């Protein structure tokens, strides 16, 4: 993994990676791109596990 573009799809994967068993979740689960911090970042820009490492439990 490296600086790549991750969207909700690859987001849950990367998150599914960084979390594995820590139990991850999706923040602001309501409107579209509600947790855009991730959904708008990794998807539009890029981030590292360290980022998704915070989006975990």
Q: What are phi and psi of 4, to 5 degrees?
A: -130, 175
Quote the DSSP letter at residue 5.
-
**Experimental technique used to determine this entry:** NMR
Question: Are 13 and 4 contacting, i.e. CB atoms less than 8 angstroms apart?
Answer: no
Q: CA-CA distance, 20 to 31, in Å (whole number)?
A: 26
Nearest alpha carbon to residue 48 among 18, 8, 9 = 18
Domain boundaries, the chain: 1-57
Q: Which two tokens stand for residue 49?
A: 């596990």
CATH architecture of the domain covering 1-57:
Orthogonal Bundle (1.10)
């Amino acid at each position: 993994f490296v600086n790549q573009h991750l969207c909700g799809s690859d987001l849950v994967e990367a998150l599914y990676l960084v979390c594995g068993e820590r139990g991850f979740f999706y923040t602001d689960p309501t409107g579209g791109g509600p947790r855009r911090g991730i959904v708008e970042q990794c998807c539009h820009s890029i981030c590292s596990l360290y980022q998704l490492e915070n989006y975990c439990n």
